Ligand binder design. Structure first.
Ligand SMILES: Cc1oc(-c2ccccc2)nc1CCOc1ccc(C[C@H](Nc2ccccc2C(=O)c2ccccc2)C(=O)O)cc1
Lengths: 260, 264
């Protein structure tokens, strides 16, 4: 049964889920309800892309690219606000706070993007729209190659059948990674992650009692996220050099500076 | 009962680990602490170090860096067969689809090699030639062109990895976990693999709780290290592509080119 130590871990899991709901406006729970049948407008081609711009709201390979960078900056702001709620984070060296965010945000972005994905497409614009995976992979130049790695990860990640209360702790574990390059004081970070890892283990045991070694299987997914990011950074360098008229927003540019 | 089988699995893998890998971490540790090894710290000590068995573990008919690289390839070829033997001792492995056995080894051996290489490293150097020698980290970093950043990423990993203070009994299970990875490309029947890895993970968790009762969340921390290994390995493959392209010897014996078809 529960015991003073495991009780403290339940309170932490409760606090993190709470802050997650407050920081992220589109939960997995809402995303799943939308995807499994309010209904979204579906963008699968050129004309439907124009019908949708009116219903929800090449220059088109560029309009999708910049929809995805505007999106990703919103997520960084949400993640940064969530990070403040992880007990101990705001007390860390401000420079290590920046480093942990710089290296953590994209691994979290792709974790949470999976919540909005099924094998056929991804929800957009707060779930008012749904853009098909075939439409995205049909884009020209390198733009058709960007979103396919994410779908591949999402389909396998989603088979773990995690809910928002599990993910709230998992993304906190991600942020508080002591191996990040350039961290000045690793021990206080590792102490916090030790506590989050304990909280996640108990959460998964209680929330998925029939799911053997879910904890370990989830931790192994950090390998797939790390590879998605480095693959993405490389594609962005290509876009930069081939499309000298396109703009990368200073926030994402600074996150990617001297990353790996 | 279930714990009994998990302890029997751990003991079985340990026993098989001892039989397949001659230089254990325990033995390497003792050497690295205190028959002292011949130390190779510069060009002259390397030349004098024919105890590195370079005429044997390399072909006659070259510059230092190339010859060292060829020596590491010979060592990796040896390790691949030790790892292969060990894999066949893992319960369930040989009963897998034979194509899947080949795929698991092909994509697993680089991860295993650099995990076990850490057993032979401290922050200042690495044991070589069955632990009879010791090549310093500074010397390797001093090699020209692409060869100077061959080993340094592995040292960085080994320093982090060794702070976990695993022993051979722990490492035996960990290595089996790596081999039974169901996400390797081209696998034909993922289910039995993930079922076996599930069992190995359970055995690893119990082993670490009994062997390191005071070390909080060591299981989780060890699993997170697989993220670093994978980045170590991808980086390493790209460097071999720069070497294969730029340091080609067109006089190289064609059979030696078939023997080293895969570079490690
Ligand atoms: C797939 C999609 O589309 C829309 C959308 C399109 C038009 C209008 C409104 C929305 N929302 C979503 C879901 C968000 O899906 C996301 C996908 C990726 C990211 C990470 C972000 N990538 C970019 C950062 C800058 C510019 C482009 C990208 C890309 O990821 C990209 C995507 C396709 C082609 C080329 C590049 C990064 O910084 O790493 C965030 C959200």
């Amino acid at each position: 049964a529960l015991n003073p130590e495991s009780a403290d871990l339940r309170a932490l899991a409760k606090h993190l889920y709470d802050s997650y709901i407050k920081s992220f406006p589109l939960t997995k729970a809402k995303a799943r309800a939308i995807l499994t049948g309010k209904s979204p407008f579906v963008i699968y081609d050129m004309n439907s892309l124009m019908m949708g711009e009116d219903k929800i709201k090449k220059e088109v390979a560029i309009r999708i690219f910049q929809g995805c960078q505007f999106r990703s900056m919103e997520a960084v702001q949400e993640i940064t606000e969530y990070a403040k709620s992880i007990p101990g984070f705001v007390n860390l060296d401000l420079n290590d706070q920046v480093t942990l965010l710089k290296y953590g945000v994209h691994e979290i972005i792709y974790t949470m993007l999976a919540s909005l994905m099924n094998k056929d497409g991804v929800l957009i614009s707060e779930g008012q729209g749904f853009m098909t995976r075939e439409f995205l992979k049909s884009l020209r130049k390198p733009f058709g190659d960007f979103m396919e790695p994410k779908f591949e990860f999402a389909v396998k990640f989603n088979a773990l059948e995690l809910d928002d209360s599990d993910l709230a702790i998992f993304i906190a574990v991600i942020i508080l990674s002591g191996d990040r390059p350039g961290l000045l004081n690793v021990k206080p970070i590792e102490d916090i992650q030790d506590n989050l890892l304990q909280a996640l283990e108990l959460q998964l045991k209680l929330n998925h009692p029939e799911s053997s070694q879910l904890f370990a299987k989830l931790l192994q997914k950090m390998t797939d996220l790390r590879q998605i990011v480095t693959e993405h950074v490389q594609l962005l360098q290509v876009i930069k050099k081939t499309e000298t008229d396109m703009s990368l927003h200073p926030l994402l540019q600074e996150i990617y500076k001297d990353l790996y």
